Every structure is written in structure tokens, then in C-alpha cells.
Amino acid sequence: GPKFPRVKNWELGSITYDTLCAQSQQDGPCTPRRCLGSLVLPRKLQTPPAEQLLSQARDFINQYYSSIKRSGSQAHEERLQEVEAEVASTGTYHLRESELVFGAKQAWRNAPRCVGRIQWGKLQVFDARDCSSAQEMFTYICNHIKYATNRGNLRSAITVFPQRAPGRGDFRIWNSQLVRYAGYRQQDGSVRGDPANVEITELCIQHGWTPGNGRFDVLPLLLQAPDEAPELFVLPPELVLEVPLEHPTLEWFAALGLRWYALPAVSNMLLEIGGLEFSAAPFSGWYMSTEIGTRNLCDPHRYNILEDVAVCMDLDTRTTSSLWKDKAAVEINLAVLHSFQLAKVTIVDHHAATVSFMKHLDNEQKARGGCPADWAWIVPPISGSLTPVFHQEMVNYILSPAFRYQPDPW
Amino acid sequence: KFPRVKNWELGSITYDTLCAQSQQDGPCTPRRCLGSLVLPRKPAEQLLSQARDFINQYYSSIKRSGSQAHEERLQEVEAEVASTGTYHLRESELVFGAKQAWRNAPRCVGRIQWGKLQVFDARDCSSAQEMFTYICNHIKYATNRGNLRSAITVFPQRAPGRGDFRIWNSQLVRYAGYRQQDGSVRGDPANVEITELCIQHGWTPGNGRFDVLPLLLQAPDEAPELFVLPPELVLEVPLEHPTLEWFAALGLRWYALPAVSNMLLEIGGLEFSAAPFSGWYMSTEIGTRNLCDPHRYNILEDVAVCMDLDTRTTSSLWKDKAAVEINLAVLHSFQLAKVTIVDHHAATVSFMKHLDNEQKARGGCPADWAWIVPPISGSLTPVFHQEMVNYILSPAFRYQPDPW
Ligand code: HEM
Ligand code: HEM
Ligand SMILES: CN(C)Cc1cccc(NCc2ccc3ccc(N)nc3c2)c1
Ligand SMILES: CN(C)Cc1cccc(NCc2ccc3ccc(N)nc3c2)c1
Ligand SMILES: C[C@H](O)[C@H](O)[C@H]1CNc2nc(N)[nH]c(=O)c2N1
Ligand SMILES: C[C@H](O)[C@H](O)[C@H]1CNc2nc(N)[nH]c(=O)c2N1
Ligand SMILES: [Zn+2]
Numbered sequence: 001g002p003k004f005p006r007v008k009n010w011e012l013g014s015i016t017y018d019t020l021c022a023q024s025q026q027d028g029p030c031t032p033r034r035c036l037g038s039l040v041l042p043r044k045l046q047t048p049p050a051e052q053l054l055s056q057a058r059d060f061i062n063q064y065y066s067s068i069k070r071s072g073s074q075a076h077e078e079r080l081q082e083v084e085a086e087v088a089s090t091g092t093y094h095l096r097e098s099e100l101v102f103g104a105k106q107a108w109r110n111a112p113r114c115v116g117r118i119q120w121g122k123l124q125v126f127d128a129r130d131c132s133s134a135q136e137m138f139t140y141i142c143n144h145i146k147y148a149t150n151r152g153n154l155r156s157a158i159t160v161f162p163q164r165a166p167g168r169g170d171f172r173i174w175n176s177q178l179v180r181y182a183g184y185r186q187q188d189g190s191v192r193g194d195p196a197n198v199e200i201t202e203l204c205i206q207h208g209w210t211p212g213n214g215r216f217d218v219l220p221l222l223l224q225a226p227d228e229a230p231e232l233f234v235l236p237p238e239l240v241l242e243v244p245l246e247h248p249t250l251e252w253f254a255a256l257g258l259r260w261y262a263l264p265a266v267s268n269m270l271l272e273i274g275g276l277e278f279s280a281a282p283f284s285g286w287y288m289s290t291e292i293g294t295r296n297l298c299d300p301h302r303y304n305i306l307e308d309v310a311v312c313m314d315l316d317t318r319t320t321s322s323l324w325k326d327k328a329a330v331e332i333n334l335a336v337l338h339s340f341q342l343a344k345v346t347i348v349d350h351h352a353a354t355v356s357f358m359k360h361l362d363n364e365q366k367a368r369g370g371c372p373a374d375w376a377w378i379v380p381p382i383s384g385s386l387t388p389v390f391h392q393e394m395v396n397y398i399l400s401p402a403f404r405y406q407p408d409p410w
Numbered sequence: 411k412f413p414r415v416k417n418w419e420l421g422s423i424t425y426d427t428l429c430a431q432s433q434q435d436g437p438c439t440p441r442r443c444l445g446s447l448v449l450p451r452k453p454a455e456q457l458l459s460q461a462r463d464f465i466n467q468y469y470s471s472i473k474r475s476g477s478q479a480h481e482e483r484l485q486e487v488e489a490e491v492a493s494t495g496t497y498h499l500r501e502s503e504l505v506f507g508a509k510q511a512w513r514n515a516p517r518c519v520g521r522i523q524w525g526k527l528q529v530f531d532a533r534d535c536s537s538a539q540e541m542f543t544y545i546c547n548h549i550k551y552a553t554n555r556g557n558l559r560s561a562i563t564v565f566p567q568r569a570p571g572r573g574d575f576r577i578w579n580s581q582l583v584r585y586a587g588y589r590q591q592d593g594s595v596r597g598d599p600a601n602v603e604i605t606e607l608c609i610q611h612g613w614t615p616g617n618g619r620f621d622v623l624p625l626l627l628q629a630p631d632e633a634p635e636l637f638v639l640p641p642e643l644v645l646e647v648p649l650e651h652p653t654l655e656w657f658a659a660l661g662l663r664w665y666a667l668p669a670v671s672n673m674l675l676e677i678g679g680l681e682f683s684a685a686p687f688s689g690w691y692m693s694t695e696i697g698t699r700n701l702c703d704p705h706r707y708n709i710l711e712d713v714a715v716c717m718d719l720d721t722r723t724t725s726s727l728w729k730d731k732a733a734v735e736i737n738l739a740v741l742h743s744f745q746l747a748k749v750t751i752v753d754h755h756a757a758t759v760s761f762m763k764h765l766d767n768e769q770k771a772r773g774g775c776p777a778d779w780a781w782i783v784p785p786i787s788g789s790l791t792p793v794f795h796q797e798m799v800n801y802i803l804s805p806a807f808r809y810q811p812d813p814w
Contacts (some may be wrong), residue, residue, distance in 0.1 A: 005444055006451060011705050022443040030438030030445070033430045034801040036413055037438070037445035038779035042439075043414075289725075292788055301419050306790070320755035326787045330730045337725045351724035372795040375446035375780055381794065383730045385698055385785035386710070388605050399489070 007370075011391035020370030025059065027399040037396060038376055043228070047404050048085050053275040056274065057083050057093060060274025062101050063106070091166050095276065099235060101125045101275035102156050107401035113377035115353050115389070116285055118360040119156055123283075124148075125129040126159040134225040137161060137171065138233045140176060141221065141282065148284045149241050149263050154346035160281035163276045169227030171280035172409045175219060176199055178265035178282055179240055182217040193217060195301055203410065207232050215303075216242075216259055224409060243343045244247040252312055258305070260336070262294045262345045270406040286346040288353045293333035294381040305332070327380055350380035354387035361392065372397045415774075419795035426799040428774030433463070434802035445800060446780050449809055455497060457679040460804065461487045461497060463683055466676030467510065468503050472640045499680065507530040507677035508562050511805035512687070517781040519757050519793070520689055522764040523560055525689075528552075528684060531565040538627040538635040541575065541684070545625065549582060549643050553667055556645060557620065558690040558750035564675065565684035569630075574683035576813040578626035578634055579604055582669035582686055583644055586621040599622065607814065613638050619707075620646075620663055628813060643744060651739040656716050662709070664740070665695045666749045674810040683810060690750040692757045697737030698785045709736065733786055754784035758791040765796070776801045 029042035065076040086093035109120040183197040224230040241262040247253035265284035315324035340347035364371035373394035437444035469480040490497035587601040628634035645666040651657035669688035719728035744751035768775035777798035
């Protein structure tokens with residue numbers, strides 16, 4: 001019937017149409033000839049003339065005034081005029097605090113790869129647009145961590161540092177997350193710690209950090225204020241909450257000495273709002289257990305502990321058909337959940353998370369006529385079809401405000 | 411441009427140039443990606459261009475391009491289309507086309523096997539009764555007492571202004587699904603509609619959870635006819651678990667032969683509306699989807715209860731634990747019965763080898779990531795970490811509407 005993508009849920013047999021994708025102003029990587037939906041970072045996902053800026057600005061101001069039900073109002077028209085003026089005189093413009101708050105939330109709401117978006121309306125937005133030094137960025141980040149960690153009762157938050165400005169250096173956090181374990185390349189070619197972090201680890205060393213030699217050394221932050229060499233800051237150990245991993249029934253699991261940090265705080269993404277670019281805007285939520293238990297601990301190119309655990313479980317690792325990988329992976333995920341619960345640190349299992357995302361989809365269908373969703377990222381890395389999202393068709397597209405990938409500062 | 415394609419586990423990069431040979435649009439646009447949708451939303455110069463392209467593919471394959479034979483064959487095809495509006499394939503072209511369609515199937519993880527396919531030419535078939543005879547022989551050959559062999563049987567092509575040959579069943583072997591007026595379904599809920607069609611065509615139904623359906627076979631412009639399969643033709647595996655003795659008590663079983671029968675085979679513009687094909691199962695199809703899907707047999711909770719798992723909460727991972735034991739039981743039972751099956755680790759490992767073979771051979775491989783990655787233990791398999799490019803090449807297997 002309708003001229004919009006028809007979306008089907010194969011478990012429930014129910015049908016929706018996505019009308020929200022018509023609001024997309026930015027092209028993704030796919031064409032009628034070939035789909036590139038499985039690519040992590042296609043060129044059409046990597047990242048001004050006042051005409052371009054103003055149209056993006058006017059679109060955002062329209063979104064804002066819609067969200068507060070004042071579209072067409074005199075205040076709506078005046079805000080528009082005021083933005084056009086700023087841009088005419090300065091080349092850029094500035095967001096009111098309530099527009100920044102709305103924009104940050106909408107960027108999270110818009111993120112197709114995030115399964116946690118049921119929470120989108122509950123985001124504490126810290127305005128750090130007054131920050132003027134790397135030391136001050138550090139102070140702001142520490143406050144973020146303390147507020148967000150909240151002794152294990154985690155709270156979603158974002159801290160927004162000053163926007164990109166014409167002919168001035170960017171504010172940048174070099175680290176990809178506020179909390180990351182070191183990866184030390186060994187003289188034999190292997191890696192001690194997290195192989196994901198070899199590059200940032202070496203950068204920290206080049207910039208003066210004295211490296212340790214454990215599997216779980218917390219990295220210092222490399223913080224860059226405009227037109228300045230990045231500076232090195234060590235997080236006070238007591239600010240970094242970690243959870244030692246144990247298993248509810250396998251007593252030997254604790255002896256493995258595994259652990260993970262409580263706070264997933266992503267720090268290298270660009271926050272874009274109405275054409276304005278916030279190159280430093282770290283945000284944090286809480287973990288879904290599979291991120292830790294499946295990806296971080298079991299990816300072959302990460303900690304890669306699957307075989308070690310399988311051996312402790314006395315499984316047959318010389319043959320695929322024993323499903324030793326599947327058995328070990330399940331017990332590792334269970335250990336993560338059990339350990340976080342025991343430590344009273346917020347965590348969500350992949351079943352609870354995907355059920356809540358289905359509720360989010362229903363909410364958004366009514367509120368906006370759709371929800372951009374990247375199926376490959378939404379479906380968890382273990383037990384895929386055991387979760388409701390597997391059976392849900394999704395439509396993926398780019399809406400703004402958006403969190404976007406940005407090239408590394410070096 | 412042509413896409414850069416990365417493997418995140420290995421760091422290796424390829425470029426897919428094969429996608430440039432696609433002459434068929436998928437569902438995505440720059441505005442929105444529809445890569446996770448199961449089904450697509452919806453004359454003479456056209457036919458001739460598809461035909462010439464396929465004939466060119468065929469002679470290129472046998473290292474005889476530009477030969478006198480190649481040039482004459484194109485003339486045959488053109489003469490036929492210009493005079494009759496259609497044309498006909500030689501057996502050897504049909505054999506080549508059936509193999510290429512499998513090779514080109516973006517959703518199939520078993521494509522390492524693509525060059526090994528027994529092709530039965532059933533184009534001399536004029537009746538539903540004859541279709542049945544061919545189908546029985548297909549099943550007999552492919553089953554091979556448990557040493558499964560891939561096969562396809564090709565019934566006559568669609569023709570202008572004449573109804574199609576069709577097999578109404580979605581697979582040659584399916585279990586009945588009986589709708590209870592108390593909402594529920596007994597058997598396989600995926601098969602309620604086909605079960606009801608069989609009944610109204612005069613099938614006397616059973617009332618079990620694993621009653622094998624009769625076939626409904628249709629010759630052009632005729633009501634379909636009902637044919638019960640001889641039970642000795644249908645190999646089934648009773649399911650037991652290597653250590654959990656109670657599992658056998660569940661009374662579960664599955665059939666050996668996965669034989670998809672409702673897809674359309676397109677070769678050189680020609681369409682084969684009945685062309686059932688079969689391989690062997692990957693264990694997750696049975697253990698995970700068929701048995702654990704909420705809208706299928708849905709046995710997770712039953713198994714979880716017997717394992718004495720805490721069902722009160724998701725965070726006990728009862729679902730994950732039960733699914734793993736169910737997949738293991740399928741693997742164990744098929745192995746015990748000497749019936750061919752491949753686990754999802756072995757299968758995805760073979761597919762990565764296939765990807766490498768195809769990169770060298772054709773400069774890429776169309777793959778549908780959402781279907782290639784197995785439905786349990788995704789990131790535990792190498793295909794999870796492999797970027798893939800999805801596109802439609804011809805010869806192709808396609809969906810077609812149900813004949814009712
Ligand atoms: C509140 C609890 C949250 C949960 C359970 C959650 C869950 C997840 C998960 C599992 C992923 C996939 C991560 C991966 O595999 O690397 C993800 C991605 C993402 N999340 Fe959420 N998230 C939460 C909060 C937030 C917040 C507060 C923001 C921003 C304000 C956010 C923005 C994003 C973005 C932009 C991505 C995609 C990142 C990328 O493309 O690399 N999330 N989330
Ligand atoms: C030889 C062993 C084979 C294995 C292990 C295998 C494996 C698989 C699996 C696991 C799927 C996903 C199906 C689903 O989830 O429902 C699939 C799909 C598919 N396979 Fe294969 N396959 C084999 C043989 C074949 C053969 C012989 C053909 C055709 C000649 C074929 C053509 C296809 C097609 C067209 C699909 C997609 C069907 C659809 O979209 O519903 N496969 N295969
Ligand atoms: C590479 N950058 C995008 C930063 C980075 C580093 C390491 C992992 C990830 N994952 C993306 C991501 C983004 C936001 C998240 C929010 C909550 C959460 N639990 N995981 C989340 C995961 C992101
Ligand atoms: C819905 N129709 C496309 C037919 C149908 C009915 C029931 C199941 C499936 N699954 C698709 C399918 C196709 C080919 C396969 C080949 C081998 C295999 N092991 N499974 C395979 C599965 C397909
Ligand atoms: C190649 C593939 O796109 C890649 O491995 C993706 C798949 N899905 C994912 N899903 C999530 N949530 N996070 C990831 O990092 C990835 N990686
Ligand atoms: C909605 C989603 O596309 C649908 O559930 C897909 C996902 N991936 C799949 N993968 C395989 N192998 N088989 C399937 O039927 C499906 N179904
Ligand atoms: Zn796409």
C-alpha cells in the first residue's frame with residue numbers, strides 16, 4: 001500500500017511502515033546495486049559554507065521548536081532570524097543550553113547501532129562549553145566519571161566540550177574510551193593486555209607515560225586542548241570502579257584473575273547538532289553483558305580466553321562439534337552477569353536489553369513513525385535468534401543530530 | 411567505487427569488483443538500507459540480453475569463448491526468441507546454470523560445495539504424477555541411506571499464457587501443523603496453511619507433532635494433486651543427548667533431507683517455477699531455529715525445566731544453556747545415525763575458505779551477513795568478523811508468490 005518501507009516481525013506476524021526514513025538528509029553506503037550494511041566503517045560513514053550550515057541549523061531549530069510544540073511561533077521565527085544573523089556575522093552560531101540538551105538526547109535517540117535507546121530520554125547533559133584547558137577537561141571528565149559511576153548505580157551522561165571553531169584547534173580526547181586497558185606488544189609478537197589498545201598504549205608511552213606490564217593496566221587519558229600538544233592525565237584509581245569476575249558454580253573461575261571496568265564511556269566520537277561539531281563529547285551508559293563476556297573477553301583479536309575457559313571446563317577442544325566454544329562462552333557471560341550483580345554494579349543481559357529495545361521500537365513507531373536500526377549491531381553476538389530482535393526486520397538510515405565517527409587526531 | 415571489504419579479526423582487506431556484474435537491483439538506496447528484510451517488497455530485447463549474457467557465461471566457463479560453437483549458439487538463441495518470444499536451454503547449459511545459481515546465492519553458507527551438485531533434467535514432464543516420480547527419485551538419490559548428496563530436479567520452465575508447474579509445499583519434507591481452536595498449534599506452526607490446503611484436497615490428517623505432510627503437485631492450469639510420500643523414502647533422526655538421558659523422553663525428531671521446493675530458478679531470463687533442491691542440514695537450522703524459535707516448536711522452556719534451570723529470570727541465561735544442549739543433541743543424534751550434518755563452526759570455516767576461493771576466481775562473493783552468521787554463537791564464528799557485500803547475480807534462485 002503506502003510508499004514507505006514495509007517492516008515485518010516474523011515472530012509476531014505484525015507489520016509496520018517506516019515513514020521517519022523520509023526525514024533522512026544524509027546518504028548511507030548502500031545503492032540499488034549492492035548493500036554495504038555489514039561494513040563497520042564505509043566511506044559514507046566517515047567525516048563550512050554558510051548555506052550548508054544554515055540549512056542544517058534551520059533544520060535543527062525546526063526540530064527543537066517541534067519538540068516543544070512551538071512550530072510557527074514568533075519565538076521560533078526569532079530564533080531562526082537570530083541564527084541567520086550569527087552565521088552572517090561570525091561564520092558559525094551557538095546553541096542555547098536547552099537546545100544542546102535536546103540535541104544530545106536526539107543524537108542518542110538517533111543512533112542506529114545502540115540497543116539501549118529505551119533510556120534515551122534519561123541522559124544527564126553536562127555543559128562543558130566553557131572549558132579552556134586540558135587540565136580543565138580532566139576535571140570535567142573526573143566529575144563525569146564520579147556522577148555516572150555513582151558507586152555502581154550507573155547513570156547515563158554526556159559531557160559536551162566546546163564546538164569546532166573556524167581557524168582554531170579542536171578539543172579532542174585521544175583515547176577511544178575513558179577507561180581502557182593497556183596493550184603491550186611483546187618481543188615475541190604477542191600482546192599482553194587488550195590488543196585493541198596497542199596503538200593508544202604506545203602513544204601514551206611516546207607522550208611520557210611510564211608503562212606497566214599487567215593484563216589489566218588502566219590507561220592514562222591523553223587530552224588535547226586547541227592547538228596544543230595532548231597532555232597526560234592519570235585517573236585516580238579510586239575513581240575507576242572495576243568488577244572482579246567469578247562464576248556462580250564453577251569455583252575455579254575466580255582464580256583466572258579476570259575483571260572488567262564498570263563504566264563504558266565512549267570518548268572519540270563526534271557529536272553533530274545543527275551543523276555544529278562537538279569533537280570532544282564523551283558519553284557513558286552501562287554495559288550489556290555480551291559486550292564484556294562475548295566480545296571483549298572472547299573475540300580472537302581481544303583477550304581471547306575461550307580456549308583457556310574451555311580447558312578449565314574439561315571440554316573437547318580438538319573438535320568443533322563438541323560445541324566447546326558455545327559452552328565456554330555461555331559460562332563466561334554468566335560470570336559477567338553474576339559478578340556485576342554481586343558487586344551491585346548496573347549491567348543488563350542481552351535478553352533483557354533486546355526486550356526493552358522492542359518496547360523502544362513500539363514507542364518510536366508511534367512517536368516518529370519509525371526507528372533507524374542497524375540489525376547487525378542490534379542482534380547480540382551470542383544467542384542471536386533467542387532474542388526478539390533477530391525476528392524483527394529493521395530499516396537503517398542517518399538522522400541528525402548524530403554521533404559520528406571521526407578520524408584519529410594523530 | 412568498488413567496496414573495500416575488511417576482516418576485523420585478521421586485518422585483511424579485499425575489493426569486491428564482482429558486484430559490477432550485477433544487473434539486478436536490491437532493496438537498498440542511499441537514503442535507507444533494507445538489508446535485513448526477508449522478502450522483496452514486490453519483454454523481448456530484455457530476454458535476449460539476459461540470454462546472450464548467460465550463453466557468454468557458459469562458453470567462458472568451458473574455455474571456448476569466441477568459438478564457432480559459441481557464435482552459432484547465440485544465433486540459435488536469438489532466432490528462437492525473435493520467432494517465438496522464448497528459447498530453450500541445452501542440458502549442459504542447464505547443469506551449468508543450476509550450479510551458478512547456487513554459487514550466486516548470497517544467503518547460503520554451504521557454497522563451498524557449489525561445484526558438486528547432481529542435476530536432474532525433468533523438463534520432459536507433463537503431469538503431476540510424473541512430477542511425483544521425479545521427486546521420489548530425487549529424494550532417494552539425495553538421501554543415499556544417510557550419506558547425503560546435493561541435488562536439484564528441474565521441471566519445465568514457465569511459458570507465456572500458460573499456468574506454472576509448481577510444488578505447493580515449501581520443502582519436500584515438512585511436518586504438519588494443526589490449528590487448535592483454543593488458539594494453539596500442534597506440530598509445526600510454520601506449516602498451518604499448507605496443512606490446511608492438504609486437508610481440503612482430501613488428505614486424511616494425523617494428530618501428532620511430527621506428521622510428515624503429503625505433497626501437493628500442480629501441472630499447468632490444473633488443480634494440484636495430493637501424493638503421500640512412501641515412509642521408507644523419508645529418513646528421520648530421533649533426537650537424544652549424549653549425557654542428559656531424559657532428552658530422548660522429549661520425543662523429538664527431525665528429518666534428514668533439507669529440500670527447498672518453492673523457490674524459482676532463473677537462468678538466462680528463463681524461469682523454472684518448480685526446481686526443488688537439497689543439500690544437508692547445518693545443525694543450527696534444526697537445533698536453534700526449527701526447535702527453539704518462539705513461532706516454531708518453541709521447546710526452550712521444556713528443555714530448561716528438565717535441566718532444572720532458573721526460568722524466573724533472563725540473567726540466569728537459561729535460554730542460552732538450553733539452546734546449546736539442544737544443538738549438541740542434534741549433532742550427536744545425526745552423528746549416531748550416520749546422517750550427514752555440519753555444525754555451525756565447521757560450516758562458517760568452510761565458507762571463509764569459499765570467500766577466499768571466490769575472491770581469486772571472480773573478484774568477490776555476494777554474501778548476506780544476517781543469514782551467513784549463525785543464529786547462536788555469532789561472534790564465535792569467523793564470518794561474524796568478516797565484512798560482506800550483498801548483490802544479485804544471475805543465474806539466481808528467487809522467491810515467487812504462493813500458487814494459491
Ligand atoms: C544506558 C545503557 C546503554 C546500553 C545498554 C547501550 C548499549 C549499546 C550496545 C550494546 C552497543 C553496541 C556496542 C558495541 O558492540 O561496541 C551500543 C552502541 C552505541 N551506543 Fe549505546 N548503550 C547505552 C547508553 C548509551 C548512551 C548514553 C549513548 C549516547 C548518549 C549511547 C550511544 C551509542 C552509540 C552512538 C553507539 C554506536 C557506536 C558505534 O557505532 O561504534 N549509548 N550501545
Ligand atoms: C550442501 C550442503 C548445504 C548447506 C550446509 C547449506 C546451508 C544453508 C543454510 C544454513 C542456509 C540458511 C537457510 C535458513 O536459515 O533457512 C542456506 C540457504 C540457502 N541455500 Fe544452502 N546449503 C547447502 C546446499 C544448498 C544447495 C544444494 C542449494 C541449491 C542448489 C542451496 C541454496 C540455498 C539458497 C537459495 C538459500 C537461501 C534460501 C532462502 O532465501 O530462503 N544450498 N543454506
Ligand atoms: C571507536 N569509538 C566509536 C569508541 C569505541 C571504543 C570501543 C568500543 C565502542 N563501542 C561502541 C559503543 C558506543 C556506545 C556504547 C554505549 C553503551 C555501551 N554499553 N556500549 C557502547 C559501545 C566504541
Ligand atoms: C520459504 N521458502 C524459501 C522455502 C523454505 C522453506 C523452509 C525453509 C527454508 N529455508 C531456506 C533454505 C534454503 C536452502 C537450504 C539449503 C540447505 C540447507 N541446509 N538449508 C536451506 C534452507 C526455505
Ligand atoms: C563485520 C561486522 O560488521 C562486524 O564484525 C560487526 C558486526 N556487528 C557488531 N555488533 C555490535 N554490537 N558491535 C560490533 O562491534 C559489531 N561488529
Ligand atoms: C528479520 C531477519 O532478517 C530474519 O529474522 C532473518 C535473519 N537471519 C536469518 N538467517 C538465516 N540463516 N535464516 C533466516 O531465516 C534468517 N532470518
Ligand atoms: Zn543495505
